[PDB]
Amino acid sequence: RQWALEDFEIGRPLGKGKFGNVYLAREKQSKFILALKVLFKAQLEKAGVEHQLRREVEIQSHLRHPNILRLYGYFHDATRVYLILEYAPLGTVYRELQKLSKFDEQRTATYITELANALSYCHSKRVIHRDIKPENLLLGSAGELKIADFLDYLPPEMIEGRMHDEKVDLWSLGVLCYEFLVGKPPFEANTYQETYKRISRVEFTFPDFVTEGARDLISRLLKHNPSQRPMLREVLEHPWITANSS
Numbered sequence: 111r112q113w114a115l116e117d118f119e120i121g122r123p124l125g126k127g128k129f130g131n132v133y134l135a136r137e138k139q140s141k142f143i144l145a146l147k148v149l150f151k152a153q154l155e156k157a158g159v160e161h162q163l164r165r166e167v168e169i170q171s172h173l174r175h176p177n178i179l180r181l182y183g184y185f186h187d188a189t190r191v192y193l194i195l196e197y198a199p200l201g202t203v204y205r206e207l208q209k210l211s212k213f214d215e216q217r218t219a220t221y222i223t224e225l226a227n228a229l230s231y232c233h234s235k236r237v238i239h240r241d242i243k244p245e246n247l248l249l250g251s252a253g254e255l256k257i258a259d260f261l262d263y264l265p266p267e268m269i270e271g272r273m274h275d276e277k278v279d280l281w282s283l284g285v286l287c288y289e290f291l292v293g294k295p296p297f298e299a300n301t302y303q304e305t306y307k308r309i310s311r312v313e314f315t316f317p318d319f320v321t322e323g324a325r326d327l328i329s330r331l332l333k334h335n336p337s338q339r340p341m342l343r344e345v346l347e348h349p350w351i352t353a354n355s356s
């Protein structure tokens with residue numbers, strides 16, 4: 111409960127980014143094996159996100175799920191800040207997606223279920239999410255997927271703030287599923303302008319090898335109007351999902 115850097119025996123550099131570096135680590139006390147991010151407050155300031163982090167570490171800490179990367183604890187010295195995190199032994203879905211180019215109908219559906227499961231929990235524990243990427247998806251030991259993200263003159267459209275923020279994740283789920291099945295995201299193009307074009311006008315096209323159940327689901331998630339995309343529950347109960355999830 112009262113953490114210091116010499117409570118930890120340090121292993122191999124696990125990669126860097128963005129403010130800090132991650133190392134492999136072990137609790138001298140419980141010999142428990144975990145990752146450790148090392149953020150520098152100097153690097154947080156020249157990016158103005160010190161309070162933003164502390165804010166989110168308090169949110170993160172109260173999220174226990176097999177499909178969400180577990181944060182165990184945190185601490186600091188004057189120069190450095192440390193985050194004690196679940197080591198995902200099997201690499202990212204990015205690296206793996208490059209190794210396999212695309213995934214099988216079942217590998218994709220299982221991954222969607224897990225995401226959906228995790229996202230539902232967040233929605234339930236009152237914490238909505240923005241965008242999910244393959245690069246932000248880590249892999250546990252048993253192939254399991256881990257989200258590792260980080261007046262009186264005022265009108266109605268300014269006091270109701272952000273109306274539909276819950277529904278972004280369903281778009282993300284649509285996009286992801288596609289990339290998993292195809293190897294590329296659905297509005298990927300050459301110019302940034304042509305990508306912007308296809309995202310705005312919702313312009314994606316399934317190559318022939320894609321199944322119907324997938325085309326059906328993906329289309330339902332990728333609706334222009336946010337309030338038309340299925341609620342997470344429905345994704346878990348989709349013919350295609352309920353036929354490949356395990």
Ligand SMILES: C=Nc1ncc(F)c(-c2cccnc2Oc2ccc(NC(=O)c3ccccc3Nc3ccccc3)cc2)n1
Nearest residue numbers: 124125126132145163166167170196197198199201258260
């Ligand atoms: C190879 N497996 C593996 N396992 C665990 C790992 F952490 C990593 C890893 C290695 C190198 C770089 N990144 C890695 O993954 C992550 C992914 C997410 C995080 N999460 C955070 O850094 C974070 C968690 C809770 C709260 C805040 C966090 N960061 C944050 C920083 C600034 C502002 C806001 C949030 C940490 C490491 N890699």
